[PDB]
Design a protein around this ligand. Sequence first.
Ligand code: A60
Lengths: 99, 99
Amino acid sequence: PQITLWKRPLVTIKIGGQLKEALLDTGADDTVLEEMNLPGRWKPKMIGGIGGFIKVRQYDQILIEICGHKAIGTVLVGPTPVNIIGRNLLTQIGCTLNF
Amino acid sequence: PQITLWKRPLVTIKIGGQLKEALLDTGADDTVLEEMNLPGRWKPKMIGGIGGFIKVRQYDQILIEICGHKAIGTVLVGPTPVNIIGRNLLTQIGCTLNF
Ligand SMILES: CCC(CC)CN(C[C@@H](O)[C@H](Cc1ccccc1)NC(=O)O[C@H]1CO[C@H]2OCC[C@H]21)S(=O)(=O)c1ccc(N)cc1
């Protein structure tokens, strides 16, 4: 679908068998979700935003469905202000910017 | 044009007679640019993201040209690591997400 930007581009995602709201964020290299219990192994990593760096748990090769589109990639879990879908997954669902 | 997301969506912009590179950021509510000396009045503001908040200067009715598309609106200026074009100006250039 085509999404205009008058409102935040929020969509429903399905990760680990749970539905969640997430922001499509072309300014994010990586996907970062709020604190949650995910199955599988994870490694501690650091990521930096506009206001500094935070500690996150890195889950690799996680299945995540975004508006009925399947992706399998890296998902970071930590104290992000909001669930964001970054380019690592936006590329997988075929997302482009157009103007 | 159509911008894929394999790499950061960086484009050339023109503001206050200066050319800069900036990120087309659907996750940013408002445009925030690196520290620069813009004339005119401004209002202090704080904006939040990963890592916390930064203090910025809010300028209103600022003209920016993005890839030849003109747009006028709020421009925040502060210690951001990257120039960010946010939804407030992305809507004005007819920019959409598509997948
Ligand atoms: C509240 C929703 C997001 C943060 C979650 C808002 N951000 C825009 C976002 O695109 C930001 C924009 C951004 C890009 C690059 C450096 C700092 C900020 N990218 C970002 O934080 O991405 C992180 C996750 O992927 C990684 O790649 C980029 C950093 C990591 S922001 O920078 O903090 C921001 C907040 C308010 C305004 N008005 C303008 C920008």
